[PDB]
């Protein structure tokens, strides 16, 4: 949650959002096979990421379990875990296929893996 992180949000391909979550995701294959997180924050920092993204016409999409799973499993400048690739790649496909405001609700097409979930859950 830095000015240095906030300066990177203009380079995002998408913000996955939804106590508030926002993760700014980039796909740049000359650097990494998997998308990577270039900004992330919760609550107010999440809304500052969103406001910058909207200023720069960067798609913001609501998929709450994906937003949370990315945030919990991916540090800044790190690739998302392999278990989230297909879900993020399908969000990216939708973003890239948009034609030339609340976030766009996108249904997930499969579950988020158990091992990337239950971050706040009290196990017995």
Numbering used by the authors: 252 to 269, 271 to 352, 359 to 382
In the authors' words:
The fT3SS consists of the transmembrane proteins FlhA, FlhB, FliOPQR, and the soluble ATPase FliI together with its regulators FliJ and FliH (summarized in: Macnab, 2004). FlhB was identified and initially characterized together with FlhA and FlhE in Salmonella enterica. It was shown that FlhB consists of two regions—an N-terminal transmembrane domain (TMD) followed by a cytoplasmic domain (FlhB-C). FlhB-C has the ability for self-cleavage between the asparagine and the proline of the conserved NP(T/E)H motif. Overall, these findings show that FlhB and FliK are important for the switching of the export specificity from rod- and hook-type substrates to filament-type substrates during flagellar morphogenesis.
First, we wished to determine the crystal structure of the cytoplasmic domain of FlhB of the main polar flagellar system [FlhB1 (Sputcn32_2563), henceforth simply FlhB], which localizes at the C-terminus of the protein (SpFlhB-C; amino acid residues: 222–376). The crystal structure of FlhB-C was determined by molecular replacement employing the structure of Salmonella typhimurium FlhB-C as search model, and refined to a resolution of 2.1 Å. All FlhB-C structures share the central domain composed of a four-stranded β-sheet in its center, which is surrounded by four α-helices. Values in parentheses are for highest-resolution shell.As observed for all other FlhB-Cs analyzed so far, autocleavage was also seen in our structure. This autocleavage occurred at the highly conserved 269NPEH272 motif and leads to two tightly associated subdomains FlhB-CN and FlhB-CC (residues 252–269 and 270–376, respectively). However, the structure of SpFlhB-C differs from the other available ones in two main features: First, the N-terminal fraction of helix α1, which connects FlhB-C to its TM domain, appears disordered in our structure. Second, our structure of SpFlhB-C resolves a PRR involving residues 356–376 at the very C-terminus of FlhB-C, which was not observed in previous structures. The PRR follows helix α4 of FlhB-C and appears as a “wave”-shaped linear motif. The PRR interacts with an extended canyon-like surface area formed by helix α4 of FlhB-C. At its C-terminus, the PRR is also in close proximity to helix α3. The interface area between the core domain of FlhB-C and the PRR is 855 Å2 of buried surface area. Our analysis identifies the following hydrogen-bonding pairs between the PRR and helix 4 of the core domain: K360-Y353, G358-Q349, G358-Q352, R359-Q349, R357-Q352, Q368-Q342, and Q368-A339.
